[PDB]
Design a protein around this ligand. Structure first.
Ligand SMILES: Nc1ncnc2c1ncn2[C@@H]1O[C@H](COP(=O)(O)OP(=O)(O)O)[C@@H](O)[C@H]1O
Ligand code: BEF
Ligand SMILES: [Mg+2]
Lengths: 65, 615
């Protein structure tokens, strides 16, 4: 009997690895690893990891000017 | 733009609103919209007078994008410099532009056409006994050319090596030069009597391309652009057979050079005795008065070290004054060293044949003063719907990188990351499934890969022949012939060598697992291998061009960038997230984690005469 507030992040392997890399650079991101498709993340960092990940993925996309 | 109220939505168009002008009463008929600032031309291909303009627009404006319905051209200095050559003056261009435009032609556009259309036709570069004379038909030009800072009925000599300077200099000064050849009145050069045998069937677009060259009666030097497999070889053969002079052919491969001789022999009555192939294998030259030389740039553009056997041949090429040069794959002539051949070899007529006229650097425009303007261009979809080239359903498969491989992709550097996302097991499975599926359909498949390590790994894993740069000319030729006629060998594994100028009429399907970054041309050249499939007219036939790319990797950045030219032509790529029925295939490569782990580490680790008896 113990509740812990947070954000449940559901995603795929590729997004999971990126979140781990972001968590390694900034420790507080990931609170706990739940499964290969779920992560518990800090509520304050939800709006930041979601915004940061898109910036990282922007490199893989070719935006013509 | 006087007393014209802006609209509330005019803000969304930043100085691009062209409503300040009014529409003509005959808008419903006229097919053209003209941008008064950018020079763009929007063409209605579904209205009357569409065909009358699709050729006129190609002459004065280079095509940006030509999709199904609405074409988009653009007028630039070089495009006008191309149109100014073939008997066209400012008045004709302006008259037709106004006659075809729904809106009146703005003054800015009229100014642009006026500036560049008056330069043509006052300087002529002639050649005599390997000596180049800049002959001009009026005396006044002497006070211009001889007083030019760069330079150095009146005709004066100029250094052979210095042609590439004056020709570019002529562009900056008012008068650019034109290379016209009156082969009818040229008697000093011995002639070669070769003609197209009756079995030949000159297709319409081939005749149109030649007409743009021989329209006035004197051969014009320039470039002809036709889709891959359209028959550029016969276009060059016809030009050689109509000029009827000693001709030399330069082609960027040994297999391709062999292809040219066989094609030249088959389509026209060129006797084998007068043909000499100057490749790395055989270097004998024809001793008959007038003959033909089919060689390659690497064997003609070399400067420092030439062998004794290859030195006599080069002198034989340089000594004689040739009458025609055919530069196959002319997108490589403006390179640092290949352009030297255009100056060393003496010729009165120069032709360029290439399906793609694009290069990453800015050297593409250099072709203007090397060989001349662009005479003719042809659409890809137009020839596709007429049965001249095959139809292809382009596809782009998204093979999501497996979790194990992907993790390493984050840490590794740029140069090794490439080998990492080329060898993900999912790509092996997708390639294996597609190969089996299409082989059952009785298709001949080609698998391209610029990376050689992956090429060998794929080939040895699937037990199929492969070709790459280290291959002796004969072995790759034997592989090519076997792939063509041997029913057991349905698929091969080519590399960057087979990217261009290799003809396989039997190939119908095409796959690529690696790529040379963002080059848009390599994609089109590779697609050309299947655009000439033999059974391209049986009902419902569609060739295939697959592009396996790893998701969430830099490959997608290059993939969406390396197909920007095919989209302009009209081809559309279809995204394939999942191959139906892929799981039920009996055995798939790297289906168990053990093999995936083994492969991961395997690719990761990649980075006294009597004393003679004594020994
Ligand atoms: N007029 C024609 N009649 C018959 N076959 C033709 C004709 N024009 C082209 N071909 C065929 O088209 C194929 C491609 O020709 P090729 O000159 O190699 O094209 P490209 O150089 O434009 O890629 C060859 O099989 C060739 O024989
Ligand atoms: F354009 Be082809 F394949 F030489
Ligand atoms: Mg060719």
């Amino acid at each position: 009997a113990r509740a812990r507030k947070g954000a449940l992040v559901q995603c795929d392997p590729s997004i999971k690895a990126l979140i781990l890399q972001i968590d390694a650079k900034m420790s507080d991101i990931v609170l706990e690893e739940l499964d290969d498709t779920h992560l518990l993340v800090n509520p304050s960092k939800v709006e930041f990891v979601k915004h940061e990940l898109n910036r990282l993925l922007s490199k893989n996309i070719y935006n013509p000017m | 733009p006087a007393d014209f109220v802006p609209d509330s939505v005019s803000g969304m168009f930043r100085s691009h609103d062209f409503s300040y002008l009014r529409l003509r009463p005959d808008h419903a008929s006229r097919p053209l919209w003209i941008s008064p600032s950018d020079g763009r031309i929007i063409l209605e291909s579904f209205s009357p007078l569409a065909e009358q303009a699709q050729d006129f627009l190609v002459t004065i404006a280079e095509p940006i994008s030509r999709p199904s319905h609405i074409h988009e051209y653009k007028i630039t200095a070089y495009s006008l410099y191309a149109a100014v050559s073939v008997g066209l003056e400012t008045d004709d261009i302006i008259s037709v532009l106004d006659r075809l435009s729904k809106v009146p032609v703005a003054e800015s556009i009229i100014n642009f056409i006026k500036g560049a259309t008056i330069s043509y036709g006052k300087v002529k570069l002639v050649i005599k006994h390997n000596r180049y004379f800049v002959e001009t038909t009026q005396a006044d030009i002497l006070q211009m050319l001889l007083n030019d800072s760069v330079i150095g009925v009146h005709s004066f000599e100029i250094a052979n090596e210095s042609v590439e300077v004056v020709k570019k200099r002529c562009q900056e000064i008012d008068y650019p030069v034109l290379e016209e050849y009156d082969f009818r009145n040229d008697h000093r050069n011995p002639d070669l009597d070769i003609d197209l045998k009756p079995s030949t069937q000159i297709r319409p677009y081939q005749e149109k391309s030649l007409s743009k060259m021989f329209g006035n009666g004197r051969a014009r030097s320039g470039i002809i652009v036709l889709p891959c497999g359209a028959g550029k070889t016969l276009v060059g053969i016809t030009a050689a057979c109509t000029i009827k002079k000693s001709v030399i052919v330069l082609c960027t491969s040994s297999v391709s050079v062999m292809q040219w001789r066989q094609q030249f022999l088959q389509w026209c009555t060129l006797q084998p005795e007068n043909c000499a192939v100057f490749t790395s294998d055989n270097k004998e030259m024809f001793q008959t008065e007038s003959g033909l030389v089919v060689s390659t740039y690497s064997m003609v553009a070399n400067t420092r070290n030439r062998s004794h056997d290859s030195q006599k041949v080069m002198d034989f090429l340089t000594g004689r004054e040739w009458g025609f040069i055919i530069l196959d794959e002319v997108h490589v002539v403006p390179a640092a060293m290949f352009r030297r051949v255009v100056s060393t070899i003496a010729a009165h007529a120069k032709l360029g044949l290439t399906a793609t006229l694009v290069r990453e650097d800015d050297k593409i425009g250099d072709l203007n003063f090397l060989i001349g303007p662009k005479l003719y261009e042809a659409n890809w979809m137009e020839l596709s719907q007429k049965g001249h080239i095959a139809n292809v359903q382009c596809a782009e498969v998204w093979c999501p990188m497996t979790a194990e491989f992907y993790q390493e992709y984050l840490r590794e550097t740029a140069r090794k990351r490439m080998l990492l996302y080329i060898m993900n097991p999912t790509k092996f499975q997708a390639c294996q499934f597609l190969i089996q599926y299409h082989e059952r359909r009785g298709d001949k498949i080609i698998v391209f890969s610029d990376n050689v390590y992956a090429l060998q790994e794929y080939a040895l894993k699937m037990g199929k022949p492969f070709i790459y740069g280290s291959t002796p000319q004969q072995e790759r030729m034997n592989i090519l012939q076997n792939f063509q006629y041997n029913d057991q060998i349905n698929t091969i594994f080519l590399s960057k060598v087979g990217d261009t100028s290799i003809d396989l009429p039997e190939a119908t399907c095409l796959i690529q697992i690696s790529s040379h970054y963002g080059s848009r041309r390599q994609e089109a050249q590779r697609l050309g291998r299947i655009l000439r499939a033999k059974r391209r007219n049986d009902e419902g036939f569609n060739a295939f061009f697959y592009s396996l790319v790893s998701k969430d990797t830099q490959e997608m950045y290059y993939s969406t960038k390396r197909q920007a030219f095919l989209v302009d032509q009209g081809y559309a790529f279809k995204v394939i997230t999942h191959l139906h029925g892929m799981e039920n295939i009996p055995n798939l490569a790297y289906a168990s984690p053990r093999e995936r782990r083994e492969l991961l580490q395997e690719v990761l680790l990649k980075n006294h005469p009597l004393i003679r008896k004594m020994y």
